Design a protein around this ligand. Structure first.
Ligand code: DHE
Ligand code: DHE
Lengths: 372, 372
């Protein structure tokens, strides 16, 4: 195809056919459909630092280096036991992916997808297995950070000095961390706890100070909810003074003081929130919901904490993505087979695109952001 | 040329020969030199939202739409009296350039450079011309915000409704505002005052509240300094709680409290700071200086406020720019005819490219952020 910029290119997961659509953000058009990515029933992706490639992580353990400008699979591998939610290094040269079988982290060359290092997780007793790994993120200083669900640990893999990483292991951080996130500035790593309440906070500027428990009331409490009903921590959105986050098993969006990490408000919403995101200018908070309320998107004023409109794009709204500067918000409607574009300032739809069971929608500006 | 991504492309201003270099950030090489941009003795630029084009604003009033993938001038126009420091709109369709003769702001279409809107400044009660316009920035909500030097006014031009802007005028904001910045979140507009000490702050979320005076001790005061010794308000760095700024006429970098806008610390530096910058992880402050100390760059620990090291890349260090994720910092060394690439974590030079009197260095990741 002809020359084009990479700044407005997006990748849409088509959930039921293992295919993706490459999108032109400015024109609001579909450039192509690419097939052969296997099981994208649940998928995540990151972008290369030049924004030409997407690294697609599938639930079949597949890692697809997708060439966005040539509209083709550049390279692809499949490793059973590889989880999704992988990350790309600060210098863009390393792609890290979690695995539950055996249990650990594998880091690959971003250019050739050749294995660079394997970090086995802590061994478990009575099993030919290691601990499951969750909450994998990239971090400043050529690091990856991740948590061990079964053993209760947060590890730092430091690749500053080349292909052999230097590990820093923190034990006894909390029972069963199920997920984690990295703060926008890349300073604080926080893993949510499933076997108990609170977050395991790690100051990456001062790892020597250890791990800190914060937000002690947040969690399943004494409720016996299964681990797959715990929130997506990518569904958190953190701002300067506040964080807007999904409640655990309640129809509330919690407002947290981000300096002391304590809840100060709870906004009643039309369902169990999954993803709580912010308009890039931080004025509004956008929320999607879990079934049976997953036909709605609610917009919340970040100042008054009040719901200002309830959108109904259609059945099965799974994911939302804003543009770099915020002139657009993209909303995938799975069971309508549409990818809708909306004006987040006029709260009006500005175009739809046919898609087959669309789910995740990602835009290449993520390439420039730690933790994305 | 061949296919490539736009996410790592840099544009270097060669201020002596009316030329620029297009740089491959990942390969740390030069892709091309493009000539014929006239007077770049002083210049700035912004990127289109797909990152394929740069809009260079020259001292000659020239506005060049440079094609970084075809490595050629796509469109150019020259309008005497135009200033540099133009901005691009939130949806990317409008490019604004300020005027100093007669005084005002002109807005062009990003694709054709055809004129869209002429906004003349306040006519001066006496002369045949208007106030000079200074401190033009893009803001969320499809707005352009600028200050009127002679009149002491802050205007907001709102293109939300179309080509005809809705203007909001704030008068008696302070004497002779010479420059302005917009906070990284896109909420606060701050104009520095030359006719009197202090800064005029405007809350773009709540324009009904009007302009407000802050940091009343920042300025020349009793000293008879010229405009052109006042600081580059682009030389400010605003962290979430703190601001790192150049002192006015002093060899110091001031640490301020961004919430209360009061000075909490002062840092003795090796010269008059011009640009105070932050590594993208906010753990370091990078400082360059004006003649005769402009052969130095000082790296400050953002926490201890102590100088970690003093770099000496060469004579005539004019500007610096980081990669989006912080793995690189690019440093222009005018009198050595070198654009250097450093590792900001190892603090060691990893590249040095030839250039003709290099000055400003800009990378495509600015395309995604308000105010850049
Ligand atoms: C680790 C992980 C990511 C990648 C985040 C990252 O790092 O970028 C992810 C992404 C997602 C993304 C978008 C990609 C992203 O990374 O943000 C969406 C829309 C999503 C909607 C759901 N997820 Fe997801 N999800 C899990 C884990 C994850 N989901 C589970 O363990 C759980 C509870 C069990 C499972 O089914 O796998 C789970 C169930 C769901 C759902 O039930 C949702 C709501 C609807 C559905 O169809 O599965 N998950
Ligand atoms: C408006 C403006 C921009 C655009 C900022 C933006 O939006 O990116 C700019 C950019 C710059 C940039 C980088 C481009 C950028 O986009 O910031 C640098 C390195 C720079 C180094 C100087 N500037 Fe600059 N500069 C002025 C105004 C400006 N300078 C002046 O009015 C003043 C005081 C007199 C003049 O000649 O214009 C002035 C003198 C200087 C210098 O003396 C400096 C320190 C050294 C030199 O010019 O050789 N200015």
């Amino acid at each position: 195809p002809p020359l084009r910029g990479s700044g407005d290119l997006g990748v849409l997961i088509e959930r039921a056919d293992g295919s993706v659509q490459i999108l032109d953000g400015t024109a609001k058009t579909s450039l192509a459909r690419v097939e052969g990515l296997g099981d994208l029933s649940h998928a995540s992706l990151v972008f290369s630092r030049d924004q030409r490639y997407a690294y697609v992580f599938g639930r079949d353990g597949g890692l697809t280096k997708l060439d966005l400008l040539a509209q083709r699979i550049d390279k692809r591998l499949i490793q059973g036991g590889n989880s999704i939610g992988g990350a790309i290094s600060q210098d863009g040269r390393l792609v890290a992916v979690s695995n539950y079988e055996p249990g650990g982290v594998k880091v690959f060359d971003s250019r050739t997808l050749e294995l660079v290092a394997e970090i086995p997780a802590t061994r478990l007793p009575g099993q030919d297995r290691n601990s499951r790994v969750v909450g994998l993120v990239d971090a400043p200083g050529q690091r990856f950070v991740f948590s061990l669900f079964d053993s209760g640990e947060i590890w730092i893999a430091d690749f500053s000095q080349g292909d052999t990483p230097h590990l820093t292991r923190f034990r006894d951080i909390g029972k069963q961390p199920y997920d984690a996130l990295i703060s926008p500035d890349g300073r604080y790593y926080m893993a949510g706890l499933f076997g108990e309440d609170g977050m395991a906070q790690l100051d990456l500027w001062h790892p020597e100070r250890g791990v800190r428990r914060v937000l002690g009331d947040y969690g399943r409490g004494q409720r016996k909810l299964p681990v797959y009903k715990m929130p997506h921590l990518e569904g958190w959105t953190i701002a300067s003074d506040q964080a807007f986050v999904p409640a655990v098993g309640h129809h509330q969006v919690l407002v947290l003081d981000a300096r002391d990490w304590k809840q100060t408000d709870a906004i009643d919403v039309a369902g169990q929130p999954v993803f709580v995101m912010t308009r890039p200018d931080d004025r509004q908070i956008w929320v999607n919901f879990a079934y049976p309320d997953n036909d709605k998107v609610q917009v919340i004023d970040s100042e008054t904490h009040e719901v200002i409109e309830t959108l109904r794009p259609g059945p099965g709204v799974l994911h939302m993505e804003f543009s770099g500067r915020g002139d657009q918000v993209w909303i995938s409607v799975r069971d309508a087979d549409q990818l809708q574009v909306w004006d987040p300032y006029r709260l009006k739809r500005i175009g739809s695109l046919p898609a087959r069971s669309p789910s995740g929608i990602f835009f290449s500006h993520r390439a420039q952001h730690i933790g994305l």
